[PDB]
């Protein structure tokens, strides 16, 4: 499964993470 989780704490809630989840 594609991993959309933030790589580290400073990417929690990041636009990239949110977008990643949005297109799964």
């Amino acid at each position, epitope marked *: 499964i594609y991993n959309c989780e933030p790589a580290n*704490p*400073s990417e929690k*809630n*990041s636009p990239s993470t949110q977008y990643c989840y949005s297109i799964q």
Partner: antibody, heavy 119, light 113 residues
Framework: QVQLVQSGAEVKKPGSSVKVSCKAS????????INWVRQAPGQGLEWMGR????????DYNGKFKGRVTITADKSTSTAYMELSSLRSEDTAVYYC????????????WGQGTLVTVSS | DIVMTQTPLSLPVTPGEPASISCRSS???????????LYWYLQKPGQSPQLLIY???NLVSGVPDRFSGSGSGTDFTLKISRVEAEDVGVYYC?????????FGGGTKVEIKR
């Protein structure tokens, strides 16, 4: 233009609690983590905690044994750090800093607030 | 917690010559994604900290090209190819791989004369 403007220097008595402000502008206040980092003399930089103002989510450094409270006021785009039961070793310059997503981390810093603990 | 340690404590530098400062972490800052979560900040005299290098080797746009960063997962170097007077201040390395975020003790760069 991203700006983080903090409250002025504060003298606090031992055992008291200080509230330091960080007024943000030039970006979406709700959607970046605001971090608090202090610089005590003879010490480097030490992380205190952070808040995501959009949902109020926080993380704290365990080292401060629950003495730190970080909050946000969306009406004024202001983040706050409160530190209770102040001791002389809490004398430090307290900075707020905005995390910039996509790997940059702490790009934007406030000017710092000197808190001096003394009787 | 991840402990960040720097050397030397103090570094007199000569404008026009190279300078290097070192950092190490108690745990590897290498993520499976290939990125190393090591950052370099500089606090110039009377100023707030600024970010110079993110993720070990990436220069923030606007930072002079004389600065560079490299290292392994646990040991890091900030290099100034040719020092300028405006490069003085306290340099801090830091990690954001894990909470709590942690910083090195700092290296204070001053002018050698």
């Amino acid at each position: 233009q991203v700006q983080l403007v903090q409250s002025g220097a504060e003298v606090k008595k031992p055992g008291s609690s200080v509230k330091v402000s960080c007024k943000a502008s030039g970006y979406a206040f709700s959607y970046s983590w605001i971090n608090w980092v202090r610089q005590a003399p003879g010490q480097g930089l030490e992380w205190m905690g952070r808040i995501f103002p959009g949902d109020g989510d926080t993380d704290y450094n365990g080292k401060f044994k629950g003495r730190v409270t970080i909050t946000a006021d969306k009406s004024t785009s202001t983040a706050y750090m409160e530190l209770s039961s102040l001791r002389s070793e809490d004398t430090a310059v307290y900075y707020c800093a905005r995390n910039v997503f996509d790997g940059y981390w702490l790009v934007y810093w406030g000017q710092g607030t000197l808190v001096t603990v003394s009787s | 917690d991840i402990v960040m340690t720097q050397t030397p404590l103090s570094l007199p530098v000569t404008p026009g010559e190279p300078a290097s400062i070192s950092c190490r972490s108690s745990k590897s800052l290498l993520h499976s994604n290939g990125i190393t979560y090591l950052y370099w900040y500089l606090q110039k005299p009377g100023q707030s900290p600024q970010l110079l290098i993110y993720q070990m080797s990436n220069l923030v746009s606007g930072v002079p090209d004389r600065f560079s960063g490299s290292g392994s997962g646990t040991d890091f170097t900030l290099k100034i190819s040719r020092v300028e007077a405006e490069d003085v201040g306290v340099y801090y390395c830091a990690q954001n791989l894990e909470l709590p975020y942690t910083f090195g003790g700092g290296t204070k760069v001053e002018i050698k004369r």
